[PDB]
């Protein structure tokens, strides 16, 4: 909420999560806020996902601005457990990062473009 500056429509989120699933099976994905943070810093991040129900918010507060000063695109997911499931986890995930997609690069690129437009 304090780190969320725009609302992602349900349909966009659906496309995003689906892309993440084919990303773990084809390319590579990072699960967890610490591993996501390092992707952005190392530049190996193409698309980072951030949950909106994170409590405390401190865990993810830095993702937005950090991503901005790294050119790395980011999208919001309403629920923590959905992001974790999409990343292939049995538990939830506050943040995820698609480290080099795969047979999804087309979709991911669009999602990034759809978000930049959504401001």
């Amino acid at each position: 909420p304090v780190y969320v500056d725009f609302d992602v429509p349900a349909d966009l989120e659906d496309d995003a999560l689906e892309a993440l699933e084919v990303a773990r099976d084809t390319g590579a994905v990072k699960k967890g806020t610490n591993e996501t943070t390092k992707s952005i810093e190392r530049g190996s991040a193409e698309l980072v996902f951030v949950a909106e129900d994170v409590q405390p918010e401190e865990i993810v507060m830095h993702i937005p601005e950090l991503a901005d000063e790294k050119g790395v695109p980011f999208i919001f997911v309403e629920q923590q457990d959905d992001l974790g499931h999409a990343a292939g986890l049995e538990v939830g995930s506050a943040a995820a990062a698609v480290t080099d997609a795969g047979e999804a690069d087309a979709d991911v690129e669009d999602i990034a473009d759809k978000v930049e437009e959504l401001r």
Binding site: V2, N34, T37, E41, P56, E58, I59, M61, H62, L66
Partner: protein
Amino acid sequence: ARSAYSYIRDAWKNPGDGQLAELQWQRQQEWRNEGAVERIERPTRLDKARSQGYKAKQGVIVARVSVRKGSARKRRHKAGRRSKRQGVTRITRRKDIQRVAEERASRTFPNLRVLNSYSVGQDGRQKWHEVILIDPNHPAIQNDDDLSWICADDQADRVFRGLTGAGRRNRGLSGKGKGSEKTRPSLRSNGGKG
């Protein structure tokens, strides 16, 4: 590269600036409506908690405690007293607020033992601290190489005997040289002059 945790830490260096400032102003509204001791599922300052010994594991508990700000809530003398001992207003307790918070938490969870604690801010009339408590009877802890030490009998009621980090600092045990003549090994053995 920087850990994600370093960002939580850096935010807390200045709790009155940035996003954290807005977070606190919102949270405290809910906190002021909560009780004296509230068990919380996750620590507000993950980095600090992990740094102090916290682990996302069975038998590890976290609780936020609010304690009033200020000096001793003291009653004025009701018998003869020399001027020196007639004070009320300027007298302050020898145990810091953080330590009071730790004891209040441990009392709430009689079976648990205090591992450590840290500050999570304050408003104009009270301070909040989150205390990390541990279940010395849970096997997930009795088998942990980093935490099993807290299961020993001599660690029972450790907070009440000042064996906590805040307890030890408040007892003047920080320094190993000059200034610790009357604090080490204990305030009591030194005649209570520490």
